[PDB]
Structures are given as structure tokens and as C-alpha cells.
Design a protein around this nucleic acid. Sequence first.
RNA 1: AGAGUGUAGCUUAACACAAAGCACCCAACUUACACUUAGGAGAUUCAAUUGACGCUCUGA
Lengths: 35, 77, 217, 85, 123
Amino acid sequence: DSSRASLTRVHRQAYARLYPVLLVKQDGSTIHIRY
Amino acid sequence: YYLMDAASLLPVLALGLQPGDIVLDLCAAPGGKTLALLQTGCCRNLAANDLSPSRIARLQKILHSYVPEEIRDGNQV
Amino acid sequence: SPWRLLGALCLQRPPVVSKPLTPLQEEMASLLQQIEIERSLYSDHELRALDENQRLAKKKADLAQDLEDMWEQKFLQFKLGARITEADEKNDRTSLNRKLDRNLVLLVREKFGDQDVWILPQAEWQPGETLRGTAERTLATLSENNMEAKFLGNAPCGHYTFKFLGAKVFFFKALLLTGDFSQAGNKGHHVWVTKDELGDYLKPKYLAQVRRFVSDL
Amino acid sequence: KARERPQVELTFEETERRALLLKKWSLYKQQERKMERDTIRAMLEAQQEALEELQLESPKLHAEAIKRDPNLFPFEKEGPHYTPP
Amino acid sequence: YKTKPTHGIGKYKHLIKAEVLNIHLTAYDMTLAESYAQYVHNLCNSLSIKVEESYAMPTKTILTTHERVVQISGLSATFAEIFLEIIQSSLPEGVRLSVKEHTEEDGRFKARPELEELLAKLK
RNA sequence: AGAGUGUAGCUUAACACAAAGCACCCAACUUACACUUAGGAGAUUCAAUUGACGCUCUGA
């Protein structure tokens, strides 16, 4: 059950806006990373 | 400020102190070098030791009078 | 005491595709996004998104959107890999890519003397080898391909004894990350079977109890 | 400048979701912990029974069964992914 | 009092005493790693598994990835089976799962309360 | 096919004046745990001491 743990909000009091940026670098693999 | 021989300040400079380092001072009292180690601000935890409680008393006095309570906290010194 | 020398290997292939979202999950995804954005100090993107746009508006009265555009539309035509490679075959149980959102077990057809039934791969245990060693032996004998199945700790997961003389079978797990099959059309009848049809796969009552040590997840 | 989003207040409509959907989380997570614990119980009982059965059959084989595996020293494993490489 | 049958009813310190795996959970996202670390720790607490520390060493210089570690102990070889299976299944997004060991080369700063009895037994 | 049993995970807790007391779950403080705070889901298996629905063990 990857789905429940995957989407989480960080418990830091102050952080910049996180957009789910796609991470591909000639690896053929899609990863959604907040940047 | 603290008046002390600038010679005694050299061994503290001789330590390549980095932030988050754990410092042991086997002979602390009366102080001077210990105060300098505290002034560095790179030491996470301080260990101060001396055999004679007479001398450690004046060590306690000087670190109390010079160093605020905020920095002492819990087992940082 | 008379015993039939049997052993079993559970080849639980891990999911390759992430589990689908229940309605509540995407509902809360949008929600947590809202909470996330509502508590922030400043972000470098908002400087170009709003601030420079505002002063540009002031300049005009007397673009971040543009650079966001090309980002968006470039990967639209550059189509990524298929999330679901399940539905295209729909029937290829022999294929590794049959179901990738759930744990699957490799299952072979055994041909016994007096009963003909689909059972989990067998292992003929020897007193020379250890119980664990039996599982490793049957990698090449039954699958005849490339194996990189990871073997965890030695422990009996389950035990079943059936009498016609008697039989004894012990179950051990293994993790097979990649199961590329050299001979797709091998004589051996091997299929990758999900948990939900695993019950319908085998007929016996006694070996239906297997479900206890194999998790659906 | 150190102020992104000052005001985020809204009508009771938002709070209705904020509350009830969080209660739905409590329910949803309740079911999943129950089934997690179900697997726990099922697993430990299964291995226990199996080991007992091996023990009574052969006293020497269960001894070699309960060794810790040296292959779990460099144990490295991944899990699920978005799309296959 | 010694001779009275109530003796040693005040005894308390006999009830107390006055006298290993590492799990790596690296992810690029900083909103993900600690969440799963939390989850694993919660599983450990429930099944009576001893935990040492959740240490974090700094982000690699640039692009930037950070490592979250959980120390665990008291795990049996038999119980490992169940435990490791769950922590493998619960893997969120391509997180490197490691099991590292203290190799007798990986000392602690003792507290003042702990030191006095240590000194008493030393001499 | 027989042999036993039955309260949400546990407890004979239950005279009532009630179906109780620990376990459990998200939320904020926390690297975390934990404590505390603010919330949620819970049962006396079904029909009149008896009979049959669920579980368990022996029946090839």
C-alpha cells in the first residue's frame, strides 16, 4: 500500500511552495518529487 | 572581556574545532582555556574535570559569571 | 514412518506499478495540497508568478506564465511509458506483466499419478541438503530461465500433511524482482496468478489454507 | 518581503469538509490497521504451527531451520514504481 | 524495620536497574522519507521491537538528496520474516531499503546521573 | 460426520442506577518516540433454560 504513505505533508513550520515536479534523466523512470 | 595570558590561548587555537564536536578537558579549573573553548561556539558538549573541588569552585564561578545560563542548559556543559 | 518428500516455494513477485487511489485518497490529495500552500513564508516561483507580473502591469499602465507553458506542453507530445500494461493482453497469464499493481505468485501444472491438479511448484527434499536448500534447487529445474530470486531467512511459513502412507510439505517464501522468461513457449505450464483468483486456481480444500501466509495487500 | 499568503479564512462550508473527511480518514485507517493486525496474527501462528510440526517430525532439522541468514547482511530491495524503465 | 515482617516493603530500586540493525530510507523528496520512518517506528513499538535512534546525516552537496535512518534491535531471526515482508510491501516510492549492522567500528556522551554509579563500580 | 465454545483485541466487568475498564486510530507540539491536548469507531451471533449461524479439534 504505497499510496497512503506517498502523499504526505511535511511537519516543518516554514517551507516554500512544493510543486510535484517530474523526475526523468534518461532513466526511463517517472518519479513525482515536490520541488 | 577576560584578562589572561595570550600564550594560554594558543592550545585552543591548536585544536581544529568544528561545529558539533565533543570536547574533553581533563584539567579545567581554574579556567581560561575552558572559557575560550566556550567562546569558540563549535563545541556541542563540554566536559570539565578537576581533582580539587576548591579550584573547580572558582571555575564554576567564572563560567557562571561570564557564560549565561542559556548556553549551559542540560549537559552541554 | 512413511512420508512423501515434498517442499514448496512461494515466488511472490512484488508490484511494479503503484497501487490505485481510492476516491478519498485523491480527495485528500487536493485537500493536503490546499493546506500545504496555505501555510508558507515565500517561494522563488511566486516572486516571478505575481510580483514581476504586478510591476509589469504598473509599467504598462504608465513572463512566468510563458515559461510555465512550454514546460507543460513539451511532455504532452513526449508521451511517457504506459501506467497500465495489463489491459492490452488481458489474457496473458504466462506473461510477467499481467498484473503489476498487486503481488503475484508463479504457479505450475503438476502431473501426479492418480490426481491431476494445479499446485504451487514442488521440491523433492533430500537428507543431504538442508530444508532451505530445497527451494534454491528447484529454481532451474522447473523454470529453466534466468532467476535472480532473493531468498530471505530460513523459517517454515506453513506445513500441510495429507494421507491417501502420508505426505509432508513445507512452504518457504522468496522475492523475485524480475522474472524474464527465456522460453516463453516452454512445455512447462507456468502462469502468474494474483491473490483474488488464487482461490479459484486450486480445487483442494486442505491446500486452500495456503491463503493464511500469503497476504493480499 | 516575508509574506506570501496572509488570509485563508472562508465560510463554514470548508470546515464541514475539514472535519468530516478527517473522520473518514479515522475510519479508513481503522480498517487498514485491523487487516494489518490480521496479517500479523495469521503470519506468526502459521510459522509457529509449521515449526512445531517440523519439530515433532525431526528434532535435528528444526535446529538447522532456525539459523539466521547471512544473505540479509547486504539485503537491498526496492518496491512499487510509477512506470517501468 | 528488619525484624518486623513488613521489612523491605520500601524496596524500589530492585524493580529498576541502576547498572543491531540500521534501516536506510533515502528519498529525494523531503516530505516523504520521515513519514515512512514514522510508520516503521510505529510498527516497531507495537510488536515490542527496541529502537535506538533515528539519526540524519546532512544532505549531499550539489542534485540534493537526504538520508533518514532508523536503528532497530531485539529482532529474532524467525520474527524477521513477518517484519521485513511488511516493510518491503509498504515501500512508498522507489525508496532504497537497506539493513546495515554495527561492525564494532561504527562510545556515547554519558549523563551526569549515569556517571556516579559507574564511578562507584569502577573503583 | 461427531467432540467443545460464544461480550468490539483482552477481562467474568456487569446488582444495577449501565451494556463497563484497559487496549486502538488519525489531528497539533515534537528528527522521532513518548507525555499531554483536541476528536473518532466500536460489541449481550440469531430466534424461545432450549434449537439452529461463526469458530476450533478430531473423521479419507
